[PDB]
């Protein structure tokens, strides 16, 4: 919409009160005209046609419980391209200041949220497994990870590169709750799924053999369910990215940590520099150790720890 750029005030998923950038013409419109070719949210209205109507309020205000979702997904997609600019100098997904779309209230007791190539999509959550899924900036911040990995190294969705993709988008979305400095840790999905039980999370990146994920290649899931275990053998490049940044000694293997900063300049690169869409988990780690060699040199610490965090998940 052309009008007036304004800042309104709302309530997230969690009850937290939060300024947002909103634009003015009759409406107040979720359209956000200072990052790049802009952010919109859209009202699915519990329908999954796509993406909605652009999301309108009358007073600025958003206080409704039907608004939270939506302030939810606007501001976190504005502290996700904060992100990618000031730490990876990176203008939205594409490079170039592509406009972020998000629609909320996507169907009804939706489970899930997901990029699908164009947009993001945020179910509301049964209300017992997951609350609505854009009060999770991790979350947020993976999904649109996966547009990032769209226009860069293009990782296909399926086996090892898939698993590949997964963990990228683990591993940004946790840099940003960092960035953002949300309660940070090294756990996925916290904030909004089972909110009756405290203490869990949908994956673990420091421990992901917790839920049952495998964090170690000889542990790996080779079937076919979930198209060859993207979400499932993701846990053996968290637990390597955990390591690199954070140390500790895994099956016997004991690695130095870097910390989160150098862990997202090495990985950044690597995605953007050397991997494919065909990659597998040898060649990543052969595009983490160029990575870190590019940046810190062959003899550093740094190429150092990458090495040892892929041996200690037994990736060589
Ligand atoms: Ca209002
Ligand atoms: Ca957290
Ligand atoms: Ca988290
Ligand atoms: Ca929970
Ligand atoms: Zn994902």
């Given amino acids: 919409i052309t009008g007036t750029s304004t800042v309104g005030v709302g309530r997230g998923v969690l009850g937290d009160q939060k300024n947002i950038n909103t634009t003015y013409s009759t409406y107040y419109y979720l359209q956000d005209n200072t990052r790049g070719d802009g952010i919109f949210t859209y009202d699915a209205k519990y329908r999954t046609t796509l993406p909605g109507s652009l999301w309108a309020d009358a007073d600025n205000q958003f206080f409704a419980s039907y608004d939270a979702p939506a302030v939810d997904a606007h501001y976190y997609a504005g502290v996700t391209y904060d992100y990618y600019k000031n730490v ?186 050397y991997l494919t869409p065909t990659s597998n988990f040898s060649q990543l780690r052969a595009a983490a150790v160029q990575s870190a060699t590019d940046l810190y040199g062959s003899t550093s610490q740094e190429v150092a720890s990458v090495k040892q965090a892929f041996d200690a998940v037994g990736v060589k």
């Avoid at 959550?125 to 996966?146: K, M, N, R, W, Y």
């Avoid at 709750?177 to 999905?189: Q, R, S, T």
């Avoid at 542990?219 to 954070?246: E, P």
């Avoid at 950044?268 to 520099?273: H, S, W």
């Fill in 88 to 273: 990876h100098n990176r203008l939205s997904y594409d490079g170039n200041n592509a406009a972020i779309r998000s629609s909320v209230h996507y169907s009804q007791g939706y489970n899930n949220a997901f990029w699908n190539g164009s947009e993001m999509v945020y179910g509301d959550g049964d209300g017992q497994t997951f609350i609505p899924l854009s009060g999770g900036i991790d979350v947020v911040a993976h999904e649109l990870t996966h547009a990032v990995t769209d226009y860069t190294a293009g990782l296909i969705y399926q086996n090892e590169s898939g698993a590949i993709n997964e963990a990228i988008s683990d591993i940004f979305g946790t840099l940003v709750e960092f960035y953002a400095n949300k309660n940070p840790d090294w756990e996925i999905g916290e904030d909004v799924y089972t909110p009756g039980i405290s203490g869990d999370s949908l994956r673990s990146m420091s421990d992901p053999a917790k839920y049952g994920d495998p964090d170690h290649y000889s542990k790996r899931y080779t079937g076919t369910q979930d198209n060859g275990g993207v979400h499932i053998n993701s846990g053996i490049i968290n637990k390597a990215a955990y390591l690199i940044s954070q140390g500790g000694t895994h099956y016997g293997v004991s690695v130095v940590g870097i910390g989160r900063d150098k862990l997202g300049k090495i990985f950044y690169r690597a995605l953007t520099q």
